[PDB]
Amino acid sequence: DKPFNLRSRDPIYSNNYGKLYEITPEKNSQLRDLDILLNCLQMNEGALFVPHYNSRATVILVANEGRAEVELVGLE
Amino acid sequence: DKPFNLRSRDPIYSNNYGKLYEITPEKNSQLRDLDILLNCLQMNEGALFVPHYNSRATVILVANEGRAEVELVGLE
Amino acid sequence: DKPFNLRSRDPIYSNNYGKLYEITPEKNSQLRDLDILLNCLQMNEGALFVPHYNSRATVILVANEGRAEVELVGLE
Amino acid sequence: NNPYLFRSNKFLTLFKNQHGSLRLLQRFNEDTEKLENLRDYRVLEYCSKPNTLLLPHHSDSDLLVLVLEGQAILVLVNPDGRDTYKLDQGDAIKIQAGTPFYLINPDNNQNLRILKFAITFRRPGTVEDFFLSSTKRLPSYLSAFSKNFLEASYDSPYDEIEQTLLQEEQEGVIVKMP
Amino acid sequence: NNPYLFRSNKFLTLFKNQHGSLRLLQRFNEDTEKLENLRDYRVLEYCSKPNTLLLPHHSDSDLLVLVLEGQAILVLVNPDGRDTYKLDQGDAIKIQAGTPFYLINPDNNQNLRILKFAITFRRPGTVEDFFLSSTKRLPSYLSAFSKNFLEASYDSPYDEIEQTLLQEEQEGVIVKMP
Amino acid sequence: NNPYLFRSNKFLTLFKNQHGSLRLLQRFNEDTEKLENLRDYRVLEYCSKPNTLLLPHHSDSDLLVLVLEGQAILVLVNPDGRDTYKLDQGDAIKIQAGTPFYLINPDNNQNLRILKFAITFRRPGTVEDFFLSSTKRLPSYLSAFSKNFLEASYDSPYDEIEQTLLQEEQEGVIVKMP
Amino acid sequence: QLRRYAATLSEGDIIVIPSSFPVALKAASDLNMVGIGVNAENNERNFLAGHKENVIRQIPRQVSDLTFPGSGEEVEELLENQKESYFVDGQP
Amino acid sequence: QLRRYAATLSEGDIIVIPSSFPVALKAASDLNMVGIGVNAENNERNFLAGHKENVIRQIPRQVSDLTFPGSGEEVEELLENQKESYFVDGQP
Amino acid sequence: QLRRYAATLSEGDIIVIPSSFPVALKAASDLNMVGIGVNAENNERNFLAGHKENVIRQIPRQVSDLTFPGSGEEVEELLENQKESYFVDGQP
């Protein structure tokens, strides 16, 4: 029942230019019942999150602190 | 597979003015596969079911015997 | 993870006039996650698949080799 | 007025003879957008008098059967046997979609009232019944099968099938028990 | 332009006093058909200043609560007790739909920013809040209950209930902590 | 006529060169309201001749792959390795949405016919394919990325990426095996 | 906006009660009803009045003084002039 | 209303069979088909004709005399002039 | 058709990233974001550039010569002029 912190685990990715934290349903029961995924992105100025994609999850990205140039590729 | 009776268990609530029977999915496998809840309400004349609400279930109430003054509060 | 063959099991039905193969979710994990059922029908010329119906599954029938006279009864 | 209220006059008549009736509650999401979460559920009410039996039929939905008044003989038919159940007032039973069944009202005194809660899935919000028997409402679905097809299936002369299975016997789906 | 982008000006104001604010993101499937898979989710943002408390209310959806900035005292109320939680920046907590709760901002220095991710189910895509208190926005839902009903429930004179429970106290759902 | 029947001429052509074809069955709930329960499923048919290979691409849906005729080399690509599968007539395989893969037809004699049953979820009833290669149909999706972005990602001169990755090689997504 | 949906149902009538909506009903005569609740997993009832399971009653004294107009003890007192639970009377 | 949807499919053609709808098909020539059934959990087939798995055949003698026009034994007899199951002939 | 959706989000802004759509973003300044991903079970990320988890890099030499215009070794080489992973630079 207790709450949890997004940084209670080691970053999935923790480069020199940035860090991404991620808590997945297979690791937490509260998110399991909702089938939700949470992650905390941290990046230095000038750093780039290389092109990639997620296989099943649709991420709602919330800008909390700073500005980010994001490039999204879709097929219409 | 056998059927079941709505009064095979002790009332969840059994006052002096009324009684409410309830069979929940966590207690029965047939209802579990449907995610349905069944309850049998019994009340004496003049008795009142105090204001309350259900957290997740939407109850379809069927008047079987008698008349009932019901007051429903919603937010539109 | 390995793939599977539709004829890796004995036919559910294997008459003299025809054969029907069927792989159900309760027998295979890949189909379980999709809640899909696959079956392979094989029939000699002139043979008839007697009137029947499926209780829960909606079958998408694909004609692969040959012609078939199918009769479907619905209620509109 | 109120979108959560459904008076008894919001039940449509499926069938109603001098022996009983089958009522169907309109779709909950019919007149209001506030009950969209109830669109796949249908409520029906089966009402019959003493010594009557709802004929053999299967439905395309799962049915939570509830005996609001009286006693009943619910007989569920399997492809490898049949299961008999003595339904008593206050008893509930789920009838797996596609299981053929007949309901019997054995008491000679009091009537029988039943509530069937329908859980649809093939065609959300719609419930259908396939009666194996033929009447004025509609004729045994076996009758829709082409002449040749019915002869090969049952391996018998057509007039003989039309004689034993297909012709109309009673006038309704609810008959008096001999 | 772009159907996947949602600027901060796409958040509607539920309430906003000189103590804080509650913002609601428009429905993801509002202007585009490409986000139909996100129709049951709603994003809200709760913003309040030091020593303030969001009054008692329960919502009809499950809420993934996320503290984007500051610390908070989330108190979840059960029918047989209450659970206190010291929410710290970076902590998340799901609030079971229907659990009444109040959020408190204890620090006297920095503000409090919270993200509530809403998972709807009663009425997909819609989120409602029932505040037990009465204000200028709306009066305690307990007040909608008829005169007689409220007297029998609480077993007290009407003017006394209207005196203790029903009358308007503060002007908003977010008040300063004494 | 009939809403449950779908002739082969109800399959739309995604792509079709002198080496093969990819057909897509129209949405089951297209012309009739009676197949609403099949709205999230799509049927496709992949047809190719000897020594051909469907180029590298991933789809946004899960795919039940079914080899109706011939043999095939299905290669599923992981971020930490690749998995090779010798598909034989009558074999089925689910391809996890998002797994990049290429299909190869090794026999020099007979053609290859495959059925892909699509289970959609991101955008119900719609299936998309992202081919990493560039052609006349469409150019590698990597090419949509801005100049600077592609240079920093791959850490190389632009003309060199446009040289190795981005420029058009073959004319279709299905090529002859050298 | 707030809204009150009041009504008396007779044999055969039905009323759907959406989760989270507060509800109460008085027995005009000896009543017997049946409810078929959907989406029932982990459901729970919460009462606003009465002795047992009354939530208004678990709200701490401090915070209750700011949630309702009453004066800290006044609400606690009010919420207990009823020793009976779930089901009550209706005679003024 | 009742309706019959008859047709011959050739290579490539598809026919969707909604659960609970009765169905039958004759092989014009050597047939080979594939069915992709959805919502298959706890699915089961029920035959209306044939020896094995014929439901019309489990209906008790008593009740069958009221469900069909035939006379109690006449239906039982009819339903067994076929010793073969699932798949049959088509020669009149 | 192909389409590029580019933009800079500031505090409070949100961007939804549909599964399977390729995505990349550069930090204009020290960035801190939060993503709430739905339908996350068995999700996995796949990178198109970089050393670790780069898929373009697992495509066999043979087949890569037919998938891209480059000449078999040219692509393998290109895909490795970057020793860093997931996060990179942005200085030309």
From the list G10, G15, G40, the residue facing B36 with the nearest CB is G40
Residue in chain H lying closest to D157 (CA): H92
G18 vs D6: CB contact, 8 Å cut-off?
no
**F162 token code pair:** 């446009």
CB C24 within 8 A of CB C31: yes
Residues of A whose CB is below 8 A from E2 = 72
Cβ neighbours of C70 (radius 10 Å): 22
Instruction: Give CA–CA dist H41/D124, Å, rounded.
Output: 18
Cβ neighbours of H71 (radius 10 Å): 11
CB D43 within 8 A of CB D127: no
Instruction: Give CA–CA dist G18/G5, Å, rounded.
Output: 12
**For residue E82, what are the β-bridge partners?**
E77
CATH number assigned to the domain with residue range I45-82, chosen from the 4 options 1.10.10.10, 1.10.10.840, 3.50.50.60, 1.10.1660.10: 1.10.10.840
Please list, in sequence order, all residues whose beta carbon lies within 8 angstroms of the beta carbon of residue G90, skipping any fewer than 6 positions away: B46, B47, B48, E148, E152, G26
Closest CA to G85 of B40, E80, E165: E80
Question: Resolution reached, in Å?
Answer: 1.7
The experimental technique used to determine this model is X-ray
Please list, in sequence order, all residues whose beta carbon lies within 8 angstroms of the beta carbon of residue G51, skipping any fewer than 6 positions away: G80, G82, G83, G84, G85
Distances (CA, A) of A32 to A5, A38, B57: 16, 11, 21
B64 vs D64: CB contact, 8 Å cut-off?
no
CA G54 to chain centre: 8
H35 vs C43: CB contact, 8 Å cut-off?
no
Residues of B whose CB is below 8 A from D64 = 31, 34, 36, 38
F8 vs H13: CB contact, 8 Å cut-off?
yes
CB G39 within 8 A of CB E121: yes
Strands, E, within chain A: which ranges? 4-5, 13-14, 18-23, 36-43, 48-54, 58-65, 68-75
Instruction: Give CA–CA dist H25/C59, Å, rounded.
Output: 14
Closest CA to B11 of B43, B33, B34: B43
Please list, in sequence order, all residues whose beta carbon lies within 8 angstroms of the beta carbon of residue I49, skipping any fewer than 6 positions away: A50, A51, F153, F154, I56, I79, I82, I88
Closest CA to D1 of D28, D32, D33, D37: D32
Residues of C whose CB is below 8 A from F43 = 60, 62
**F44 token code pair:** 């496709």
CA distance I13 to chain F (A): 22
CB E61 within 8 A of CB E42: yes
**Alpha carbon distance, N-terminus to C-terminus of chain I:** 30
Please list, in sequence order, all residues whose beta carbon lies within 8 angstroms of the beta carbon of residue C29, skipping any fewer than 6 positions away: none
Instruction: Give CA–CA dist I48/I35, Å, rounded.
Output: 21
Instruction: Give CA–CA dist D169/H68, Å, rounded.
Output: 6
CA distance B31 to chain D (A): 8
F146 vs I6: CB contact, 8 Å cut-off?
yes
3-class DSSP state of I26: strand
Which CATH topology does B1-76 take?
Jelly Rolls (2.60.120)
Residues of F whose CB is below 8 A from D121 = 37
Closest CA to B41 of B74, B7, B71: B7
CA distance D126 to chain B (A): 17
Instruction: Give CA–CA dist E120/D13, Å, rounded.
Output: 35
Residues of A whose CB is below 8 A from E90 = 5-7, 40
CB C66 within 8 A of CB H8: no
Q: Do chains F and B touch (3 or more CB pairs under 8 A)?
A: no
3-class DSSP state of E154: helix
* Rounded to 5°, angle at Cα E114 from E113 and E119: 160
Q: Which of E2, E29, E119 has the most I C-beta neighbours within 10 Å, making it the best mutation to test the interface with I?
A: E2
Domain ranges within chain E, ordered by starting residue: 1-178
Residues of A whose CB is below 8 A from E91 = 3-6
Instruction: Give CA–CA dist F143/I7, Å, rounded.
Output: 17
H/E stretch holding A31? helix A29-32
H/E stretch holding I8? strand I2-9
Instruction: Give CA–CA dist D108/E40, Å, rounded.
Output: 53
I43: contact with A, CB 8 A cutoff: yes
Instruction: Supply the CATH classification number for the domain F1-178.
Output: 2.60.120.10
Cβ neighbours of D76 (radius 10 Å): 18
* Phi, psi for residue F153 in degrees, rounded to 5: -60, -60
DSSP F100-165: -EEEEE--SSS-EEEEEEEE--SSTT---EEESS--SS---GGGGS-HHHHHHHHTS-HHHHIIII
Distances (CA, A) of E167 to B15, E15, F115, F175, G22: 31, 20, 68, 78, 19
| CB hemisphere CA count around E126 (13 angstroms) | 11
B49 vs G25: CB contact, 8 Å cut-off?
yes
**D43 token code pair:** 């409520």
Residue in chain I lying closest to E2 (CA): I5
Residues of E whose CB is below 8 A from A31 = 64, 94
D36 vs E124: CB contact, 8 Å cut-off?
yes
CB B47 within 8 A of CB G88: yes
**F83 token code pair:** 């998995």
D14 Rama sector, left if φ>0, alpha if ψ -120 to 50, beta otherwise:
alpha
* Phi, psi for residue F144 in degrees, rounded to 5: -75, -20
